[PDB]
């Protein structure tokens, strides 16, 4: 207990009388009203020490306040049985579940992967959406960003993705140990969080996965630190527990604004458009938590989600995740506002590990070629959509009309997946060959002869 | 009082070992040159004090200057004998007359209006211009912002507006760093009208200090407040060259080394701008109405500057002057796109002006918008005027620009004359071409 607080300015406070203090140290602040508010040390000096109370210094009298020093940094209670319990921004209970008995305690900061020990993506990962695991294939050890927008149900897409993530490797003929999913929420609305818990408990994936939810009403420190903790959670199931894991981050924009308030907590002059200049490194300690480890069977894959500011791709968030992450999954505001299914623009959709996630033995031999053929059909179909919007439908050419039907179909069918609906990769290849069958055999220059002879039937 | 000072940063002065200091107080200082001036205390901290000079700190010795502090805030001598006369930036008579007898003495800062005692004016005051009283309805008691550009004749238009306007309406003017030529032209117009005897103002010119003009506007504001709360008559307050006032306030905040915003403006300016708009409004039980109608110049002919942005966001509606229409050679250049009046609501309809008022206003906005898009189309595409709708839209836009937009400065037209002129001008477009006009409005004028 320390009443030695020197002064309180905003959420951060300074306290004299400190000996042998550390960085990012935890402290428990008992306020004058008897309230217990947790806090973390922002900085330390030889005279006093600066901490930050998550509950704020509001209503806390510097005279009558007491401070108990924990003497330790940010840590996590790692366990193999940790899966199935719900927690809050501070790692405390949320859904009123049980208290997990910890197998081992670890630091939340973690450590980066050694250069010679890194392993590339090999095994394919099924996304489950008709527009996701098919067009741009995804594999374990790949960084795939998901760009959503304002008014876009990125929550529902994340729920469908989590519902389809469990079945990602049913066709693998690793089966005994269920794939672990990690949900981290930062600055989410009440309706979205409630629907998240309701759908998570309803799908039954709430038991086989882990959820940490920090809402908008909650402090920024909870939402910002939620990510590193969940990262340690995915790290424990890979290097130690050795199991297949999948990471998903929701509302990275709120975590960016939270990181902005946290960076402003050091009272530093902000950079361009109110963002820290170290944000490159801030994301570099985040997206670097994904990959395959050499000698370890368990691999961790991450697919974050972020809202582009004011419907602009010039946004610092998009620009930061752009050169860093491998490929990007965007959202078309046109497809979402036309009353259709998942609005991922076929042009913008790409994945760098798509080379390792398809083919015979990985996904299918009908995957890549037909993907490129369908994408070309949608693109040329759009070009024909503009050309027919010019000279009319009487001027429609062979490839033009073929692309018109192919575009209308791909848009109203191929694009259409479902809300909770998850279709198998085989269903994707079959629906693809069948929908592309509308065109003749020579109408697709994107197809190989061997493929055309061994597939079309 | 202290004759001993610590240091001096620009116009701002700071003294040490001062007692019984008053923040925002009137202070009389006698300098080394024998010159005496007035100033206002910015702040007081501990045993030290910080006061500012309104007339400037130039030509003063730290030892030979003596600062007499009243210990109380600034109190202006409001009187009813100020009619037809003139005062300087410091309040001193510039009319070469003597000091008038003061009826009362109160703060120049004015007083906050009570929440339950306020009154929403529906009053309709004829502007006199066909493009003014119609487009943006002129109402006594309302607040209409005015943003102009450099080299723009805003003074001429404002003068023609005050002249063709006129129980008569008393006008009170407030000059902040006003130009010599501007003052000369305003004097020429006010004298040409003959209403100069019924008007009064505090003059702080460009040759004179503009930093003491910030209080001059406040003085004229207290004058309007005293005119509304006592004399019970229609009052109109005006702040001239408010851009210089914003630049000066920005200089005062910059000298304070405080947190600067856009264009050097202060951080608490959110309230400060309100003080410029707090010079308007009526009260419950008062027959008189006070309405502030300030005019400022947007920097580099850009309304995107903090000044025009705050002036537009705070006050309801703004009167815009286009540089193109002013360079065209036609009369007064009000842009129907940017210009608007929130007081054009209660002042329209039957019982106020006419039942064809609001409809013709909205139809005018639609015709101007369609004409503008038709102008963009006529520029991008050929001279074929983009089929039918755009042809009638562009023709009606140009016709309304050469007629309705320009009513003249020396001509005073009623609202009915403008309505009839618009009735003759809207005949080029079809009756079904107006989507803003209802069934009654279409059957309104068939004459």
């Amino acid at each position: 207990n320390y009443n030695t607080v020197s002064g309180v300015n905003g959420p951060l406070v300074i306290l004299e009388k400190v000996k042998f203090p550390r960085y990012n140290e935890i402290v428990n602040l008992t306020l004058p009203d008897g309230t217990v508010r947790q806090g973390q040390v922002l900085e330390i000096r030889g005279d006093r020490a600066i901490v930050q109370v998550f509950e704020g210094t509001s209503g806390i009298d510097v005279k009558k306040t007491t401070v108990e020093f924990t003497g330790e940094s940010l840590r996590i209670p790692v366990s193999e049985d940790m899966l199935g319990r719900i927690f809050d921004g501070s790692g405390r209970p949320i859904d009123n579940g049980p208290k997990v008995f910890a197998e081992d305690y670890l630091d939340i900061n973690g450590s980066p992967i050694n250069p010679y020990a890194r392993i590339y993506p090999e095994e394919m990962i099924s996304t489950g959406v008709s527009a996701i695991d098919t067009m741009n294939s995804i594999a374990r050890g790949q960084k795939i960003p998901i760009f959503s927008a304002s008014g876009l149900p990125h929550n529902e897409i994340a729920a469908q993705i989590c519902r389809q993530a469990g079945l990602v490797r049913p066709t693998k003929d690793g089966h005994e140990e269920n794939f672990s999913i990690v949900f981290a929420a930062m600055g989410v609305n009440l309706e979205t969080a409630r629907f998240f818990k309701q759908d998570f408990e309803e799908n039954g994936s709430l038991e086989r996965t882990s959820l940490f939810l920090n809402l908008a009403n909650d402090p920024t420190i909870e939402r910002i630190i939620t990510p590193r903790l969940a990262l340690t959670t995915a790290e424990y199931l890979a290097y130690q527990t050795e199991r297949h894991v999948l990471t998903i981050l929701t509302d990275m924009s709120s975590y960016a604004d939270a990181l902005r308030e946290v960076s402003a907590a050091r009272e530093e002059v902000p950079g361009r458009r109110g963002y820290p200049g170290y944000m490159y490194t801030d994301l570099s300690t985040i997206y670097e938590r994904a990959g395959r480890v050499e000698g370890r069977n368990g691999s961790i894959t991450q697919i974050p989600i972020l809202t582009m500011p004011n419907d602009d791709i010039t946004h610092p968030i998009p620009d930061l995740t752009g050169y860093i992450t491998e490929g990007q999954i965007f959202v078309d505001r046109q497809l979402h506002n036309k009353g259709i299914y998942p609005p991922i623009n076929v042009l913008p959709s790409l994945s760098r590990l798509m080379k390792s996630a398809i083919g015979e033995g990985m996904t299918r031999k009908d995957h890549g070629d037909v993907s490129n053929q369908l994408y070309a059909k949608y693109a040329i179909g759009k070009d024909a959509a503009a050309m027919k919007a010019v000279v009319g439908e009487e001027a429609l050419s062979i490839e033009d009309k073929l692309s018109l039907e192919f575009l209308e179909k791909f848009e109203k069918t191929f694009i259409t997946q479902g809300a909770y609906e998850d279709r198998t990769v085989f269903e994707s290849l079959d629906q693809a060959w069948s929908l592309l069958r509308i065109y003749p055999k020579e109408m697709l220059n994107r197809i190989s002869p061997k493929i055309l002879d061994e597939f079309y039937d | 009082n202290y004759n001993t000072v610590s240091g001096v940063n620009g116009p701002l002065v700071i003294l040490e070992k001062v007692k019984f200091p008053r923040y925002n107080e009137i202070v009389n200082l006698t300098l080394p040159d024998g010159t005496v001036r007035q100033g206002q205390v910015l702040e007081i901290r501990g045993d030290r004090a910080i006061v500012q000079v309104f007339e400037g700190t130039s030509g003063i010795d730290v030892k030979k200057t003596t600062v007499e502090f009243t210990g109380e805030s600034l109190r202006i001598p409001v009187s009813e004998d100020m009619l037809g006369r003139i005062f300087d930036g410091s309040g001193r008579p510039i009319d070469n007359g003597p000091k008038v007898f003061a009826e009362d003495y109160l703060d120049i800062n004015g007083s906050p209006i009570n929440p339950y005692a306020r009154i929403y004016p529906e009053e309709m005051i004829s502007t006199g211009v066909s493009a003014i009283d119609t487009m943006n309805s002129i109402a006594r008691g309302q607040k209409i912002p005015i943003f102009s550009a450099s080299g723009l004749p805003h003074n001429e238009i404002a003068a023609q507006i005050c002249r063709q306007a006129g129980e008569n309406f008393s006008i009170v003017f407030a000059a902040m760093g006003v130009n010599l030529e501007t003052a000369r032209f305003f004097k020429q117009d006010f004298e040409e009208n003959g209403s100069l005897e019924r008007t009064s103002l505090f003059l702080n010119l460009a040759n004179d200090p503009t930093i003491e003009r910030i209080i001059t506007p406040r003085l004229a504001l207290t004058t309007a407040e005293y005119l509304a709360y006592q004399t019970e008559r229609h009052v109109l307050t005006i702040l001239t060259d408010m851009s210089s006032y914003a630049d000066a306030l920005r200089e005062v905040s910059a000298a304070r080394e405080e947190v600067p915003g856009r264009r050097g403006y202060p951080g608490y300016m959110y309230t400060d701008l309100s003080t410029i708009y707090e010079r308007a409004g009526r009260v419950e039980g008062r027959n008189g109405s006070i309405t502030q109608i300030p005019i400022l110049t947007m920097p580099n002919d850009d309304i995107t500057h903090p000044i025009p942005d705050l002036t537009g966001y705070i006050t309801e509606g703004q009167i815009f002057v286009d540089r193109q229409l002013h360079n065209k050679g036609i009369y007064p250049p009000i842009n129907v796109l940017p210009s608007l009046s929130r007081l054009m609501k209660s002042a329209i309809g039957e019982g106020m002006t006419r039942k064809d008022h609001g409809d013709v206003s909205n139809q005018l906005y639609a015709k101007y918008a369609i004409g503008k898009d038709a102008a963009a189309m006529k520029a991008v595409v050929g001279e074929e005027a983009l089929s039918i709708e755009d042809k009638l839209s562009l023709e009606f836009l140009e016709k309304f620009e050469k007629t309705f937009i320009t009513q003249g400065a020396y001509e005073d037209r009623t609202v009915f004359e403008s309505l009839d002129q618009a009735w003759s001008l809207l005949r080029i477009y079809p009756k079904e071409m107006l989507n803003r006009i209802s069934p009654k409005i279409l059957d309104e004028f068939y004459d």
């Binding site: 009272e267 530093e268 002059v269 | 080394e257 947190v259 600067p260």
Partner: peptide
């Protein structure tokens, strides 16, 4: 502005050290 706050804070620190001395 941030540099001004840092310098003012450094002056505060200097004042604290002076008080300590």
């Amino acid at each position: 502005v941030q540099e001004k706050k840092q310098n003012e804070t450094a002056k505060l620190d200097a004042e604290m050290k002076l008080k300590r001395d």
